[PDB]
Amino acid sequence: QYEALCGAYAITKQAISDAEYIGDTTGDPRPKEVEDLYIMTLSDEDYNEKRKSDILQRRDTYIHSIPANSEARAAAHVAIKRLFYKAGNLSANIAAAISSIKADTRSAGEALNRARCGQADCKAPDQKWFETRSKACSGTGEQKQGMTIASDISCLCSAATGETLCSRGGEGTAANAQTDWSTTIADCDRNVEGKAPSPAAIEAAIAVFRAALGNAEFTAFVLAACVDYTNKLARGTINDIPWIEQLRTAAAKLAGVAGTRAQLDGMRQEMRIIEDQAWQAFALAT
Amino acid sequence: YENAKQYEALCGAYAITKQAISDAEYIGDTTGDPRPKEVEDLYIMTLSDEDYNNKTLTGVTEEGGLEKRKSDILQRRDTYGREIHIANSEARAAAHVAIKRLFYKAGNLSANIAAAISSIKADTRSAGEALNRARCGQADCKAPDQKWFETRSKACSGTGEQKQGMTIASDISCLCSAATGETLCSAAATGGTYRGGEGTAANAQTDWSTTIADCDRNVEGKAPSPAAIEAAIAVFRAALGNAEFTKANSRKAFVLGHGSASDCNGGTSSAACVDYTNKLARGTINDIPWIEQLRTAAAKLAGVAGTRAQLDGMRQEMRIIEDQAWQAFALATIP
Amino acid sequence: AYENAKQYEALCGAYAITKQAISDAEYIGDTTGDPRPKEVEDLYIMTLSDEDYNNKTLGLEKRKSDILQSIPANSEARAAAHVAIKRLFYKAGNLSANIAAAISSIKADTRSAGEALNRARCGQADCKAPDQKWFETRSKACSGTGEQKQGMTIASDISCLCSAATGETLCSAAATGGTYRGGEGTAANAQTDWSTTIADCDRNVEGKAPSPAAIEAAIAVFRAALGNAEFTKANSRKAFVLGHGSASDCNGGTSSAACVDYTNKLARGTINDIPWIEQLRTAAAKLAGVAGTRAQLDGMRQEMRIIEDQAWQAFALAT
Ligand SMILES: *[C@@H]1O[C@H](CO)[C@@H](O[C@@H]2O[C@H](CO)[C@@H](O)[C@H](O)[C@H]2NC(C)=O)[C@H](O)[C@H]1NC(C)=O
Ligand SMILES: *[C@@H]1O[C@H](CO)[C@@H](O)[C@H](O)[C@H]1NC(C)=O
Ligand SMILES: *[C@@H]1O[C@H](CO)[C@@H](O)[C@H](O)[C@H]1NC(C)=O
Ligand SMILES: *[C@H]1O[C@H](CO)[C@@H](O)[C@H](O)[C@H]1O
Ligand SMILES: *[C@H]1O[C@H](CO)[C@@H](O)[C@H](O)[C@H]1O
Ligand SMILES: *[C@H]1O[C@H](CO)[C@@H](O)[C@H](O)[C@H]1O
Ligand SMILES: *[C@H]1O[C@H](CO)[C@@H](O)[C@H](O)[C@H]1O
């Protein structure tokens, strides 16, 4: 077999790229113009920073002025005061939304890693990744079945009677599994160029796993073999078996990045709108 | 122990049909959808003494609340101080048309916003009817009764009248009901009633809410997703196969069963099968009646996502219309 | 009998998407908001000063009388509302230019996507009529014995998988190709074994607009069907074969021989390296970029309409 096992390894060894979701970062801060225009409309008390220098210069053609010190300067100010506040109070929402995405992506990254490696220590092959071959692949004494992606490449790919079909029944092959990890990866780690994670790719891998579920050897939701996920299955759902649940939790956090993406793009457009709104309000002060 | 994977596929499809599509999961918040009260309140301001009265009955905007608020709009809702919310300069009149332009546009958008909501309401209910039409033979799917199955001969083997795939239940009933019993489909999977070729849909109903137990305990608190429908078909097509049958009209890969059969309208454990060759003529699994309804529901669930994008965009225009109204209101505050 | 249909249907789904039209106009809304709003151009002349008001710097009088069904009075706003309109005027001027580039970017992206679909089905971006250039020899298209032009086209893999001597409705619900028999690659014989084999797919086509997800979905369908666990000797990776089973060659005489052994063409175990899936991915990627550019297009149209609203607010100062 050995098809969904290495496939899930590539999906767990994908690359979460926060930058490909956050995107612009240029319109996210409060537009400099709605801040420069604001100061020039501060009447004759608050205006009198080293930033007044950048304003009233850099015409960019070959841009700003102190308007009439009448009520129109304050009349324009109260118009842009909300425009100034709206950008600043929207940039915080954009920044908070970015932190939501960054938390979700890494959390989905942790779930993707914790699905394969232990916690997040996949930099080196911990021995806790692989367990005994009676309580982890058979689950007799303790119900510790099918824990990780690599916790299943031990059974059906160790012991005897196999012509690399999956490229110590009862005992623990922890070190042999550590060696079998090197042999197994050699038939893997090709990756898929690590393009990006996708919630559909997790469901597709999950669905592909459900296809290979089944075997007609001697001791129903199984994959000799020594797998028998029915040990910890409890109710038939794979929502109990660990690595499927960890993959699903990662998809749930990854599902939220698109929702914040639609919110985030529209908020940036509003900032671009608030720029154009402000210039047509500086004319209020003639 | 025999037809376990096939049940897992059908139970997966049943799960989505048992899932509910709440309308508000797509419509969302509607407190900002209507015409903003700020742009309305600003419109009463730039009106002068004339046209500002209850007796303007010939033209009234939303003054069915007997006006009243016309003079009470000038409130004091601010910070520790009171600032917000009208003389009668030429700027007052010149600001009215600027508000009137956005006052119209906000109201038009409110109608357009409501129009997109009605599209979502219709599509979701139309989609909801489709999922039901797969689980039952109706758009309601209420009582596990009322004969939404058919005879064994017609529904499982397609001998008399080609009626395979009519409902996900019929395919579940045929696959999990035979004389020979085991943990074939589920734990309590014997299905003794629906055994003979003459076995009517009543027999299936009598052993329906006994083999469907695990499925209803496994439907989780999620919502149907168009990928979930396509996923449900993927596990279904993966399980379709039984290399043993009746030669002609035995196109396998269209058989949901096991072992030598020669029939699926019988008592043998093997006859716990459904041959679709007599319905899947075109050659596609997607021609099974509950597959099309699954795809019909998934298609409608993709349509509401786009209308949601239109709905969200309209509320953005409404909100920036509210801000632009204050800009036009600042025209009047000129000496 | 039908012994490759599970493999055939996966290939037929891809052929269905390639035989589908993207309709370059479905991703555009209208040519109303795209051009510069004439009202802003109209309001430009109502405050276009009194000098340069009819001085066309190489007409203006016809446009100044065009406004017939307020007054271009010489006040401050005649030069104090023009500046606000000027700021808006060229902002919408660049915006409509960017809109035109976005439309051209969409059209170029859809054509490149549509070319890729034709490239996967046929080998060229012009799927006009069945040509011998579409297929190649068994040695190349199916068995990989002599050259590695294996996954060139879906059309060659279909002809390799659904054509052999021994074959009763091997797939396609009607007949089996009887000329592409063994070393006789005869790409012309694969052309004779084409219209008979491909007629079911020319009925499975529907009004399903070519979508990025459907292309990735059909690839998953092919992934499931990719397998032949018996096959033959070294460099015969059994997971990367598409056939009945228990063979030693591909496209020979046996129905089993109707197989495609990508082992020689494939590398790093990535099916996303067979020619047709590559093009399918290229088409899917470009189609996604169409969605992104269309999202920009509607956003730009939104900014143009608000610019026109700002024009009156700027122009209302002249009263
Ligand atoms: C894009 O917007 C800019 C905004 O300035 C336009 O630039 C002006 O174009 C007018 C055209 O008659 C010239 O007279 C000005 O000298 C330009 N000013 C500057 C600062 O560039 C420009 O025309 C717009 N369109 C394009 C294609 O650039
Ligand atoms: C924006 O936030 C400031 C405080 O940071 C607050 O004083 C102001 O009222 C807010 N205005 C808006 C429009 O949100
Ligand atoms: C819709 O727009 C038209 C434009 O003439 C306007 O007369 C009408 O009042 C608008 N709708 C509403 C509900 O205001
Ligand atoms: C299913 O039922 C048949 C007929 O009784 C039996 O022969 C098989 O052994 C069983 O699995
Ligand atoms: C399916 O049923 C047949 C008898 O029809 C039996 O021989 C097989 O063992 C069973 O799987
Ligand atoms: C190819 O399939 C045919 C069916 O027509 C069978 O007769 C052969 O044995 C097989 O190789
Ligand atoms: C495929 O063709 C081989 C040729 O030997 C035959 O043995 C198999 O029975 C058939 O399916």
Numbering used by the authors:
A (entry chain A): 27 to 74, 88 to 101, 105 to 209, 218 to 269, 276 to 279, 294 to 356
B (entry chain C): 22 to 106, 108, 110 to 358
C (entry chain E): 21 to 78, 86 to 96, 107 to 356
Copy out sentences from the published article reporting this entry, exactly as the authors wrote them.
Long-term immune evasion by the African trypanosome is achieved through repetitive cycles of surface protein replacement with antigenically distinct versions of the dense Variant Surface Glycoprotein (VSG) coat. The mature VSG proteins are attached to the cell surface by a GPI-anchor, and consist of two main regions: (1) a large, N-terminal domain (NTD) of roughly 300–400 amino acids that is most distal to the membrane and (2) a smaller, membrane-proximal C-terminal domain (CTD) spanning 80–120 amino acids beneath the NTD that harbors the GPI-anchor. These large subdomains are elongated folds centered on a three-helix bundle scaffold.
VSG11 and VSG615 are related to VSG3 (the topologically-similar class of monomer/trimers with O-linked glycan PTMs), denoted as class B or N4 in the literature. NTD structures of VSG11 and VSG615 were solved to 1.23Å and 3.2Å resolution, respectively. Both reveal a fold similar to VSG3 as well as the presence of O-linked glycans on the top surface of the protein–one observed on VSG11 and two on VSG615. Interestingly, VSG615 crystallized with two trimers in the asymmetric unit, and these trimers align well with those of VSG3, VSG11, and VSG1954, providing additional support that class B trimer formation is not a crystallization artifact, but could represent the relevant, biological assembly. In contrast, in class B the bottom lobe residues are present at the N-terminal portion of the NTD sequence between the amino acids that form the first and second helices of the bundle. The second fact is that many of the class B VSGs are post-translationally modified by O-linked carbohydrates, whereas none of the class A VSGs have been found so modified. Finally, as noted in the Methods, the structures of VSG21, VSG545, VSG558, and VSG615 were solved by molecular replacement using an AlphaFold model of these VSGs as search models, indicating a very close fit of the model to the experimental data (a general idea for X-ray phasing implemented by several groups due to the accuracy of AlphaFold models).
